[PDB]
Scaffold this active site. Structure first.
Site, mmCIF file in Angstrom:
data_model
loop_
_atom_site.group_PDB
_atom_site.id
_atom_site.type_symbol
_atom_site.label_atom_id
_atom_site.label_comp_id
_atom_site.label_asym_id
_atom_site.label_seq_id
_atom_site.Cartn_x
_atom_site.Cartn_y
_atom_site.Cartn_z
ATOM 1 N N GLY C 149 0.815 -1.201 0.000
ATOM 2 C CA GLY C 149 0.000 0.000 0.000
ATOM 3 C C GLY C 149 0.856 1.262 0.000
ATOM 4 N N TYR C 155 9.966 3.288 1.348
ATOM 5 C CA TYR C 155 10.843 2.175 1.648
ATOM 6 C C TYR C 155 12.229 2.372 1.037
ATOM 7 C CZ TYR C 155 6.507 -0.340 2.945
ATOM 8 O OH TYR C 155 5.346 -0.726 3.528
ATOM 9 N N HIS C 161 9.526 4.613 6.515
ATOM 10 C CA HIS C 161 9.458 3.217 6.913
ATOM 11 C C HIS C 161 10.842 2.574 6.937
ATOM 12 C CE1 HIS C 161 5.177 3.080 6.803
ATOM 13 N NE2 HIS C 161 5.023 2.841 5.527
HETATM 14 C C1 LIG Z 1 -3.682 -6.403 7.640
HETATM 15 C C2 LIG Z 1 -2.960 -5.576 6.610
HETATM 16 C C3 LIG Z 1 -1.744 -5.006 6.915
HETATM 17 C C4 LIG Z 1 -1.033 -4.243 5.968
HETATM 18 N N1 LIG Z 1 0.186 -3.744 6.329
HETATM 19 C C5 LIG Z 1 0.863 -3.092 5.424
HETATM 20 C C6 LIG Z 1 2.149 -2.641 5.782
HETATM 21 O O1 LIG Z 1 2.662 -2.847 6.865
HETATM 22 N N2 LIG Z 1 2.833 -2.014 4.759
HETATM 23 C C7 LIG Z 1 2.330 -1.719 3.496
HETATM 24 O O2 LIG Z 1 3.029 -1.083 2.700
HETATM 25 N N3 LIG Z 1 1.057 -2.117 3.187
HETATM 26 C C8 LIG Z 1 0.379 -2.790 4.097
HETATM 27 N N4 LIG Z 1 -0.883 -3.256 3.778
HETATM 28 C C9 LIG Z 1 -1.412 -3.000 2.423
HETATM 29 C C10 LIG Z 1 -1.303 -4.141 1.419
HETATM 30 O O3 LIG Z 1 0.040 -4.502 1.094
HETATM 31 C C11 LIG Z 1 -1.971 -3.723 0.112
HETATM 32 O O4 LIG Z 1 -3.357 -3.443 0.285
HETATM 33 C C12 LIG Z 1 -1.919 -4.797 -0.960
HETATM 34 O O5 LIG Z 1 -0.600 -5.026 -1.457
HETATM 35 C C13 LIG Z 1 -2.790 -4.386 -2.118
HETATM 36 O O6 LIG Z 1 -2.799 -5.503 -3.024
HETATM 37 P P1 LIG Z 1 -4.213 -6.142 -3.308
HETATM 38 O O7 LIG Z 1 -4.015 -7.253 -4.274
HETATM 39 O O8 LIG Z 1 -4.839 -6.367 -1.983
HETATM 40 O O9 LIG Z 1 -4.855 -4.856 -4.022
HETATM 41 P P2 LIG Z 1 -6.302 -4.486 -4.588
HETATM 42 O O10 LIG Z 1 -6.668 -3.173 -4.008
HETATM 43 O O11 LIG Z 1 -7.145 -5.677 -4.299
HETATM 44 O O12 LIG Z 1 -6.011 -4.328 -6.156
HETATM 45 C C14 LIG Z 1 -5.375 -3.082 -6.633
HETATM 46 C C15 LIG Z 1 -6.130 -2.485 -7.805
HETATM 47 O O13 LIG Z 1 -5.910 -3.257 -9.016
HETATM 48 C C16 LIG Z 1 -7.172 -3.575 -9.605
HETATM 49 N N5 LIG Z 1 -7.077 -4.821 -10.375
HETATM 50 C C17 LIG Z 1 -7.393 -6.093 -9.969
HETATM 51 N N6 LIG Z 1 -7.212 -7.007 -10.890
HETATM 52 C C18 LIG Z 1 -6.765 -6.287 -11.988
HETATM 53 C C19 LIG Z 1 -6.399 -6.679 -13.290
HETATM 54 N N7 LIG Z 1 -6.440 -7.936 -13.719
HETATM 55 N N8 LIG Z 1 -5.988 -5.714 -14.149
HETATM 56 C C20 LIG Z 1 -5.967 -4.449 -13.719
HETATM 57 N N9 LIG Z 1 -6.280 -3.966 -12.521
HETATM 58 C C21 LIG Z 1 -6.680 -4.941 -11.686
HETATM 59 C C22 LIG Z 1 -8.141 -3.628 -8.422
HETATM 60 O O14 LIG Z 1 -9.506 -3.554 -8.770
HETATM 61 C C23 LIG Z 1 -7.655 -2.407 -7.630
HETATM 62 O O15 LIG Z 1 -8.181 -1.186 -8.132
HETATM 63 C C24 LIG Z 1 -1.596 -4.024 4.694
HETATM 64 C C25 LIG Z 1 -2.857 -4.571 4.406
HETATM 65 C C26 LIG Z 1 -3.525 -5.366 5.316
HETATM 66 C C27 LIG Z 1 -4.863 -5.948 4.942
#
Ligand SMILES: Cc1cc2nc3c(=O)[nH]c(=O)nc-3n(C[C@H](O)[C@H](O)[C@H](O)COP(=O)(O)OP(=O)(O)OC[C@H]3O[C@@H](n4cnc5c(N)ncnc54)[C@H](O)[C@@H]3O)c2cc1C
Ligand SMILES: Cc1cc2nc3c(=O)[nH]c(=O)nc-3n(C[C@H](O)[C@H](O)[C@H](O)COP(=O)(O)OP(=O)(O)OC[C@H]3O[C@@H](n4cnc5c(N)ncnc54)[C@H](O)[C@@H]3O)c2cc1C
Ligand SMILES: Cc1cc2nc3c(=O)[nH]c(=O)nc-3n(C[C@H](O)[C@H](O)[C@H](O)COP(=O)(O)OP(=O)(O)OC[C@H]3O[C@@H](n4cnc5c(N)ncnc54)[C@H](O)[C@@H]3O)c2cc1C
Ligand SMILES: Cc1cc2nc3c(=O)[nH]c(=O)nc-3n(C[C@H](O)[C@H](O)[C@H](O)COP(=O)(O)OP(=O)(O)OC[C@H]3O[C@@H](n4cnc5c(N)ncnc54)[C@H](O)[C@@H]3O)c2cc1C
Ligand SMILES: NC(=O)c1ccc[n+]([C@@H]2O[C@H](COP(=O)([O-])OP(=O)(O)OC[C@H]3O[C@@H](n4cnc5c(N)ncnc54)[C@H](O)[C@@H]3O)[C@@H](O)[C@H]2O)c1
Ligand SMILES: NC(=O)c1ccc[n+]([C@@H]2O[C@H](COP(=O)([O-])OP(=O)(O)OC[C@H]3O[C@@H](n4cnc5c(N)ncnc54)[C@H](O)[C@@H]3O)[C@@H](O)[C@H]2O)c1
Lengths: 272, 271, 272, 271
Positions: C149, C155, C161
């Site tokens: 995120g 980083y 971070h």
């Molecule tokens: C408990 C928790 C702790 C976390 N801690 C951290 C932390 O310490 N450090 C940090 O940096 N982050 C942290 N995060 C964030 C996390 O790393 C990110 O939310 C995650 O990497 C996002 O990836 P996703 O697949 O979940 O994204 P999504 O939001 O599910 O997908 C990203 C975007 O791409 C789109 N998409 C999907 N499929 C396709 C496709 N085929 N083609 C084009 N677009 C597409 C989606 O619709 C969306 O708009 C944390 C999250 C959680 C839940």
């Protein structure tokens, strides 16, 4: 003050005769006031594979990597892997180098083979300017101590396996002498696994007795590099006038320089 | 529809050694060969014999001997699976090509280790079946070697000496010992100082040779029938064969020179 | 290339970029003639908690239970839970292992963490005899594919971070390399939820392009285990003579083997 | 009359980890602390984030994102009750002790899951208030870790490498990120090779430390005041702080090493 000795050992088991012969050599040499360093390659978990990981700095050309060229730069600029450098320091210090190993597939074990490959780098162990008797280790003496499972008759002129002098040549000439070493008569311990414990003890005592006066021994005969044209345009061929002096003789010079004639008996086993 | 194993001992895909592996694969497939590979660096192949090579119960853990233990482990089927995989490749293979750079007058450590771990007793040799009577008498092997040194340096009058002597421990001591018929080695000298147009030629030469590789005459090694294959006789050459050879000027081979002259290019050219 | 690949995925939603990157990798690999097995951990309802229930036979000591020791016996005697064994078979088959997950709390998700804990049992995935580059998976290659995120600037060396190289170290060295894996450059996809659709498509295509020639890549540099004394009495410390060769150098070896000096730039992100 | 939460991630009551939880409870109560526990295994705590963690209306069920949905669910008060229960324990707690065995250079999966489900946005962090400005700047946390490996293995020259690097993601990335002042971790190395006499000593050492735990100096993390806490600047370290640091030999911390040396035991000892 007294002289220094390096013992390179290529056997995995402490219960082995090879290990017993390393311990005997250390004992015998210390008692004559030698300093004794060891490279027990299996105990060290020595890594015998040449790779990029051996250079810890900037490669000259990472897209088109050549270990000869890169390793030599890394020596000169001082960013060789520290495990290599440690072994090189042992060699620079060492006046006598003893290689204790079992013959495996008519050669040195893979781990000892790898040691040569990673440790004997250009500029350090050989140049090109200075090969063979003019090489960097002409001050030093080396000896092979080999054990076999096969009997000595099998490695005689008429043995199934053939002349042991031929087998030793690549190692003693190609590796040791190439880097300058004066190579002493190898300690050949044949068919060790059919020798009873009382006779093995005798062999160890024989080995210890030899090491008392090891330094005074005559080295094996290799053709001096002075018999050759040491430049590229001549092809490092034997001088035209040396070929003329040798035309007439019935024996060749050595196992590798047999010159299409007979090899001097035990060229790689006995000195003259 | 015959099978070929290509063992390669070079770390870099950018190498001429890799180029010669690719050329051999190409050429052989095009003649309807199946081609299996052992790219030892790509496999991260482990070349050190250890206890870890036997996966089951040791016969004697307090006094371990790799010859004896490895042989039991083969017969009882608890060799390390990485060894067994290579052995299956060999059992299938009719032709084995070893592609490697000469390093310190020998095979690279990783290829040396491959021989040590893969060529186990009973599988690759016994002693009752040595040399021409060995388990791989059905199979053919060829060395493809590159050098940094020029071929003049490995001529009879070269600084380094006869290349026939250098090849002997490998071709006789390892390959023939296990039964292989050994073909003429492909010797590619001073490759790093060969111009690009000539390297292309060498590859094409290699490919052309592999078209009719199977028909080639093997190198000459003394048949084991010339010797007394038992311990009391010392594995010496039969008394009557020494009598037939007393008169001849040339010896039989590099290793069986018999204190005489070595047949020209015994380990390089076939009869 | 008739080689096998395992893709471990730790995301619950099929609508996720993580799922999109799993699908892209499968696509790209199959098209190059790879077999592709999957562990979609959420879809499998994978259980990530170590318990007694993981051993299905006789416990050695039920009154004083220790998961390290008990799990190892259960592997050797073949009575591990079948869900663990299924994953282990996938690993034994697999030449390449791809871990696709979102960074959660500077780490792998709990469910992937649990997978490591239950699946990477002693004797199977590591012994103390064979750690790091000598470990059971030295034949295999692994790569992390991480989404975050937070933006990549966060980083960087000067990010709030801190260095991402430090964050990756426990996973890539502590888990993957410890078991033998050659670890390839991680695929880091920063701030994915604030990347426009056209650039996400680019990232997928970039990922697919990389996987075409993944096998030929150089792995990340970890200190060879040959630099250390791999036995308890020595403390698994770096060999005394290797410390002597390294005393003088300005850069450390890796993030974890920084040796109180500077860390090689992007040690856990770029190969040399 | 201050409150303490002890989070424990070990399944066995017969464990040293359980012994160290009991010792901490003992020592703290005797100094007039209230002590709440989260024995995660005993609770059968569920460590997997899922939709089931939100009990009300999802904002977007077709395109579900746990960060965003969980935050709304906190604000509107329809988080899963098992999460909420743990959050109440944290809000009350002045000191949080995490007792766990190191598992794969990290916290156990069940403790990892606890962080993931319990440390939700707005509750435990906002992007407005990170690190030293975070919601738990009032609170103190300490890791109590046991290892199987000896401490030499996690020394600068150990096979496994610097333990300071291993602790960083947890102490900075999880605890400090949420505001906690992080105390020196209690590291109990190779506990399963420690004789009974010495274990008793370690417990007594732990109990003695907890008497005056509150007065201790916390570990050093770079204040967030050294950074531009806004998106356009990229959360990079201020230009003038980089200028002050150009000349110094040591970096600020393990994560903010700045391409230089890490301060000795940055994550283990206070300055
Ligand atoms: C408990 C928790 C702790 C976390 N801690 C951290 C932390 O310490 N450090 C940090 O940096 N982050 C942290 N995060 C964030 C996390 O790393 C990110 O939310 C995650 O990497 C996002 O990836 P996703 O697949 O979940 O994204 P999504 O939001 O599910 O997908 C990203 C975007 O791409 C789109 N998409 C999907 N499929 C396709 C496709 N085929 N083609 C084009 N677009 C597409 C989606 O619709 C969306 O708009 C944390 C999250 C959680 C839940
Ligand atoms: C892969 C491989 C390839 C091989 N290839 C070849 C080949 O090409 N040619 C060939 O000839 N051989 C070959 N061999 C055989 C090899 O050379 C022998 O196994 C070796 O030489 C035996 O030496 P060792 O020290 O290992 O003997 P061990 O059997 O380990 O020792 C011999 C005996 O001495 C005993 N002993 C040890 N120390 C003492 C002591 N202090 N006092 C009394 N007794 C003691 C031991 O317990 C044992 O009973 C090969 C072996 C291997 C593993
Ligand atoms: C440890 C060690 C010890 C050694 N000891 C010895 C020794 O004892 N004796 C000895 O003689 N040598 C020795 N050598 C040298 C060795 O024999 C040579 O380095 C090797 O044979 C060169 O072959 P290569 O494939 O490695 O060459 P490369 O340099 O990799 O290839 C040669 C050239 O061909 C080019 N090329 C690559 N692919 C192609 C293609 N498809 N078409 C056309 N051109 C192409 C390359 O780009 C390069 O320009 C040693 C080397 C090492 C590392
Ligand atoms: C999946 C997994 C992964 C792991 N990964 C790692 C890793 O990456 N790195 C690492 O270093 N370790 C790792 N470990 C090992 C772990 O760190 C240790 O096993 C653990 O920290 C040891 O503590 P324990 O509480 O489990 O010990 P136990 O062995 O349960 O107890 C220690 C000893 O103290 C005794 N004892 C119990 N109660 C008392 C008491 N009241 N008073 C006195 N003595 C008592 C016990 O009977 C025993 O003899 C891993 C373990 C697992 C299961
Ligand atoms: N080149 C090789 O590596 C190689 C080749 C063949 C055999 N070997 C080794 O040698 C072993 C051969 O065993 P084997 O079955 O032929 O029996 P053996 O050779 O060990 O014993 C029988 C023979 O030993 C000889 N011998 C000499 N002195 C003896 C003594 N004091 N006591 C007993 N025998 C004596 C006799 O000629 C007798 O015929 C193999 O198992 C292997 O370990 C190694
Ligand atoms: N590092 C990781 O990632 C990881 C993962 C899981 C578990 N672990 C832990 O690692 C442990 C592995 O056990 P280990 O290999 O440390 O056990 P160990 O080898 O330490 O146990 C045997 C000990 O007894 C000593 N010993 C016994 N008899 C002796 C004698 N006669 N002379 C001298 N020394 C003697 C040995 O020297 C050794 O220290 C697991 O049980 C677990 O706790 C680590």
């Amino acid at each position: 003050v007294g002289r220094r000795a390096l013992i390179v050992l290529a056997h995995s088991e402490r219960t082995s005769f090879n290990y017993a012969m390393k311990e005997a050599a250390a004992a015998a040499l210390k008692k004559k006031g030698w300093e004794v360093v060891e490279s027990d390659l299996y105990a060290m978990n020595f890594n015998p594979i040449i790779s990029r990981k051996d250079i810890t700095g900037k490669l000259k050309d990472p897209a088109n990597f050549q270990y000869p060229a890169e390793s030599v730069l890394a020596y000169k600029e001082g960013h060789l892997s520290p495990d290599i450098v440690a072994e090189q320091k042992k060699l620079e210090a060492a006046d006598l180098v003893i290689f204790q190993f079992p013959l495996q597939w008519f050669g040195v074990p893979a781990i000892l083979k790898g040691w040569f490959e990673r440790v004997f780098i250009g500029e350090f162990a050989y140049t090109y300017a200075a090969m063979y008797d003019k090489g960097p280790f002409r001050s030093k003496k080396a000896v092979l101590s080999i054990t076999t499972g096969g009997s000595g008759s099998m490695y005689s002129l008429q043995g199934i396996h053939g002349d042991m002098n031929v087998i030793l040549w690549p190692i003693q000439s190609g590796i040791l002498h190439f880097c300058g070493f004066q190579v002493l008569e190898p300690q050949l311990t044949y068919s060790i696994g059919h020798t009873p414990a009382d006779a093995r003890i005798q062999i160890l005592e024989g080995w210890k007795k030899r090491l008392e006066n090891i330094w005074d021994e005559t080295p094996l005969y290799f053709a001096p590099s002075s018999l050759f044209d040491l430049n590229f345009q001549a092809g490092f061929l034997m001088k035209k006038e040396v070929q003329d002096e040798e035309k007439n003789k019935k024996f060749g010079l050595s196992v590798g320089h047999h010159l299409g004639k007979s090899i001097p008996t035990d060229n790689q086993i006995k000195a003259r």
